[PDB]
Write an enzyme that holds these catalytic residues in place. Structure first.
Site, mmCIF file in Angstrom:
data_model
loop_
_atom_site.group_PDB
_atom_site.id
_atom_site.type_symbol
_atom_site.label_atom_id
_atom_site.label_comp_id
_atom_site.label_asym_id
_atom_site.label_seq_id
_atom_site.Cartn_x
_atom_site.Cartn_y
_atom_site.Cartn_z
ATOM 1 N N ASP A 155 1.609 -9.893 -9.648
ATOM 2 C CA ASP A 155 -0.326 -9.693 -10.313
ATOM 3 C C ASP A 155 -1.043 -8.125 -10.568
ATOM 4 O O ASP A 155 -1.610 -7.451 -10.598
ATOM 5 C CB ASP A 155 -1.009 -10.047 -8.490
ATOM 6 C CG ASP A 155 -1.741 -10.461 -8.852
ATOM 7 O OD1 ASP A 155 -2.727 -10.692 -9.975
ATOM 8 O OD2 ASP A 155 -2.572 -10.363 -7.654
ATOM 9 N N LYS A 157 -2.986 -6.096 -12.617
ATOM 10 C CA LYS A 157 -4.342 -5.193 -13.438
ATOM 11 C C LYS A 157 -4.978 -4.747 -13.174
ATOM 12 O O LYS A 157 -5.133 -4.041 -11.733
ATOM 13 C CB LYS A 157 -4.800 -7.484 -13.297
ATOM 14 C CG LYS A 157 -4.275 -7.541 -11.701
ATOM 15 C CD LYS A 157 -6.034 -8.513 -11.457
ATOM 16 C CE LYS A 157 -5.882 -9.337 -10.714
ATOM 17 N NZ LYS A 157 -6.837 -10.584 -10.162
ATOM 18 N N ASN A 160 -6.244 -4.477 -8.912
ATOM 19 C CA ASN A 160 -5.600 -4.157 -8.595
ATOM 20 C C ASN A 160 -5.405 -2.751 -8.074
ATOM 21 O O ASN A 160 -3.819 -2.623 -7.107
ATOM 22 C CB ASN A 160 -4.528 -4.943 -8.208
ATOM 23 C CG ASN A 160 -5.138 -6.661 -8.255
ATOM 24 O OD1 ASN A 160 -6.313 -6.485 -7.440
ATOM 25 N ND2 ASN A 160 -3.866 -7.289 -7.954
ATOM 26 N N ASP A 173 -2.428 -5.941 -3.449
ATOM 27 C CA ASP A 173 -2.801 -6.949 -3.283
ATOM 28 C C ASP A 173 -1.123 -6.865 -4.219
ATOM 29 O O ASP A 173 -1.183 -7.854 -4.752
ATOM 30 C CB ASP A 173 -3.879 -7.714 -4.627
ATOM 31 C CG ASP A 173 -3.954 -9.335 -4.073
ATOM 32 O OD1 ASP A 173 -2.596 -10.275 -3.440
ATOM 33 O OD2 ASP A 173 -5.091 -9.430 -4.868
ATOM 34 N N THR A 190 -3.061 -13.734 -13.318
ATOM 35 C CA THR A 190 -4.226 -13.852 -13.830
ATOM 36 C C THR A 190 -4.219 -14.352 -15.535
ATOM 37 O O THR A 190 -3.729 -13.360 -15.969
ATOM 38 C CB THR A 190 -4.868 -12.474 -13.893
ATOM 39 O OG1 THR A 190 -5.622 -11.965 -12.643
ATOM 40 C CG2 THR A 190 -6.265 -12.187 -14.358
HETATM 41 C C1 LIG Z 1 -7.679 -6.388 -3.047
HETATM 42 N N1 LIG Z 1 -7.851 -5.087 -2.831
HETATM 43 C C2 LIG Z 1 -7.231 -4.931 -1.634
HETATM 44 O O1 LIG Z 1 -6.806 -5.327 -0.445
HETATM 45 C C3 LIG Z 1 -7.879 -3.508 -1.129
HETATM 46 C C4 LIG Z 1 -7.175 -2.807 -0.421
HETATM 47 C C5 LIG Z 1 -7.835 -1.408 -0.421
HETATM 48 C C6 LIG Z 1 -9.050 -1.024 -0.747
HETATM 49 F F1 LIG Z 1 -9.956 0.318 -0.315
HETATM 50 C C7 LIG Z 1 -9.954 -1.662 -1.572
HETATM 51 C C8 LIG Z 1 -9.582 -2.819 -2.019
HETATM 52 O O2 LIG Z 1 -10.248 -4.046 -2.332
HETATM 53 C C9 LIG Z 1 -10.118 -4.233 -3.237
HETATM 54 C C10 LIG Z 1 -11.033 -4.999 -4.272
HETATM 55 N N2 LIG Z 1 -9.993 -5.555 -5.528
HETATM 56 C C11 LIG Z 1 -8.470 -5.204 -5.277
HETATM 57 C C12 LIG Z 1 -8.397 -4.015 -3.781
#
Ligand SMILES: CN1C(=O)c2ccc(F)cc2O[C@@H]2CNC[C@@H]21
Length: 339
Positions: A155, A157, A160, A173, A190
């Site tokens: 994933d 991109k 992430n 992610d 994606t």
């Molecule tokens: C999937 N993803 C997360 O799991 C994540 C993990 C930690 C964080 F501080 C923020 C956060 O949010 C974003 C929103 N898009 C990518 C991210």
């Protein structure tokens, strides 16, 4: 290099011990105060939360069990949590707690206040080659680590990749990450980032992560990805074609690296040859990179995000704020026994 060999051998030892005995049920929802939604998806959301007893901030990913089942993501969600609880690397977001309740699965991760690389890229326009190279080196080391554990990430991109307080990357992610000994077959990722062998429904391997790195490096340095179109089928035709055009401002070394990462034939793609990751680490575009200094986080970053403190959300965007409901009745308990 003996130092790299001993490092990766210990890394695999420590991963396998946690892989074989996963942690589970290490907090619950009412231990946290909900602050703000950081991102949404078709079966999940990510919210900034504050742990009531310690005051620490975390990013809590909330997956609705019923939606996970409908969208055929059960195995993927079990992969994500089992992998994240077992890995440990300077550029991977840490899983701090996980638990489930009647309705949801929860993965509580460290909060990275600098926001997504995507936002900064679009705000600045494009990254200079040293700036793109600093982030690419971290991805190269992270993939060297994951691939040595037989993991494929799937994933990559800009959304992430979060930017931490020191300007370094945190990869987030793991919803598509998988432990694979040979090939795997799922259609996921994606469109702009998919390798040809994914689009063509072939069994594929870690080479798809190296293709995705080529796309990411191109996007960081150009400001837009190499293959784009309104419809995914048109993107896919471009991906499979074997052609790409580079901006004139790209260095000759960058173009050469990208031709070898964006190689349609997976058996000729950098990262998937006899010398594995070393064909990338030793490439001329990385000639100025001190791989050890990157790993040790001793390089001054090209960019430090602006934020006021560990709970500041200004680098994330605004989403509609919805309830976290927990049903009075257990949903999908059998399907999620291992979580
Ligand atoms: C999937 N993803 C997360 O799991 C994540 C993990 C930690 C964080 F501080 C923020 C956060 O949010 C974003 C929103 N898009 C990518 C991210």
């Amino acid at each position: 290099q003996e130092s790299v060999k001993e490092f990766l051998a210990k890394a695999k030892e420590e991963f396998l011990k946690k892989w074989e005995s996963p942690s589970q049920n290490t907090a619950q929802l009412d231990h946290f105060d909900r602050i703000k939604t950081l991102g949404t998806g078709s079966f999940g959301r990510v919210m900034l939360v504050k742990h009531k007893e310690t005051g620490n901030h975390y990013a809590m990913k909330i997956l609705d069990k019923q939606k996970v089942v409908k969208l055929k993501q059960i195995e993927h969600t079990l992969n994500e949590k089992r992998i994240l609880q077992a890995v440990n690397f300077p550029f991977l977001v840490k899983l701090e707690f996980s638990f489930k309740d009647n309705s949801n699965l929860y993965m509580v991760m460290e909060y990275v206040p600098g926001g997504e690389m995507f936002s900064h890229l679009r705000r600045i326009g494009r990254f200079s080659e040293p700036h793109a190279r600093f982030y690419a080196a971290q991805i190269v080391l992270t993939f060297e680590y994951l691939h040595s554990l037989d993991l494929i990430y799937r994933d990559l991109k800009p959304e992430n990749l979060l930017i931490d307080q020191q300007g370094y990357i945190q990869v987030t992610d793991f919803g598509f990450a998988k432990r694979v000994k040979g090939r795997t077959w799922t259609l996921c990722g994606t469109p702009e980032y998919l390798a040809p062998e994914i689009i063509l429904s072939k069994g594929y391997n870690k080479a798809v992560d190296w293709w995705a790195l080529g796309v990411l490096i191109y996007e960081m340095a150009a400001g837009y990805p190499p293959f784009f179109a309104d419809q995914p089928i048109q993107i896919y035709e471009k991906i499979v074609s074997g052609k790409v055009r580079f901006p004139s401002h790209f260095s000759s070394d960058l173009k050469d690296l990208l031709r070898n990462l964006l190689q349609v034939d997976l058996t000729k793609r950098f990262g998937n040859l006899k010398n594995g990751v070393n064909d990338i680490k030793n490439h001329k575009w990385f000639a100025t990179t001190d791989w050890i200094a990157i790993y040790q986080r001793k390089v001054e970053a090209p960019f430090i995000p602006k934020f006021k403190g560990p709970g500041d959300t200004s680098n994330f965007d605004d989403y509609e704020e919805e309830e976290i409901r927990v049903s009075i009745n257990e949903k999908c308990g059998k399907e999620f026994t291992e979580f």
